[PDB]
């Protein structure tokens, strides 16, 4: 945090769908790559790719409830983790005006597993927590696909060094959903791992 001048950002980015059975109980799979990250769990494919943003996720929690897969892909502890999530002012610059957080949904609901046992809901309202609306429109680009309901995105893009360089960059923030009259929450519980 010591202008090089290098800035030194993170980056959430969730994605929650609901499809259109309930779901599968599947063995989770997620691949980090190059400005990206995917995860394959309860019958969806969840893709993230990050274009003009010079940022990498480090992590992919998952969670799975009735009918709705949940993805958090994220950035850790920025000074300890590899590859660290660094960049130059002028690629800042670029993420404020640029960045675009490429989101893809692909359904692979495979009939070779059996429908997730559910007892009472693991999940309750007050699991769900309202966020800030977004500050930079069109930051999500969102695909579906056929076995999707809904779904609902937010990104938060924020600074490793505000508190520290004796100034700070704006929260870059951005929600979508395809649900209509819904308030603006997203699952705050702890995912697993995948």
């Known amino acids: 945090c010591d202008s090089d001048n290098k800035e030194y950002m993170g980056i959430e980015v969730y994605v929650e769908a609901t499809l259109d059975e309930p779901l599968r109980q599947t063995t989770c799979e997620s691949k980090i790559h190059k400005?990206?990250?995917?995860?394959?769990?309860?019958?969806?494919n969840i893709s993230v790719d990050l274009l003009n943003c010079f940022l990498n996720f480090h992590?992919?929690?998952?969670?799975?409830?009735?009918?709705?897969?949940?993805?958090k892909f994220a950035s850790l502890d920025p000074w300890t983790t590899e590859p660290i999530n660094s960049m130059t002012h002028?690629?800042?610059?670029?993420?404020?005006?640029?960045?675009?957080?490429?989101?893809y949904l692909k359904c692979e609901v495979?009939?070779?597993?059996?429908?997730?046992?559910?007892?009472?809901?693991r999940l309750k309202p007050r699991d769900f927590k309202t966020v800030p609306p977004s500050n930079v429109g069109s930051m999500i680009e969102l695909q579906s696909d056929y076995c999707?309901?809904?779904?609902?995105?937010?990104?938060?893009?924020?600074?490793?060094?505000?508190n520290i360089k004796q100034h700070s960059i704006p929260t870059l923030r951005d929600y979508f959903t395809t649900k209509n009259g819904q308030p603006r929450k997203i699952l705050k519980k702890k995912f697993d791992n995948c």
């Open 148 to 162: 999707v309901n809904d779904v609902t995105t937010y990104v938060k893009i924020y600074d490793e060094c505000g």
């Open 110 to 121: 495979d009939k070779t597993k059996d429908f997730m046992k559910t007892n009472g809901n």
């Open 59 to 71: 992590t992919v929690g998952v969670y799975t409830n009735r009918d709705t897969v949940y993805a």
């Open 90 to 103: 002028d690629d800042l610059v670029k993420l404020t005006e640029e960045c675009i957080v490429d989101i």
């Open 35 to 44: 400005y990206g990250a995917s995860v394959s769990n309860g019958g969806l």
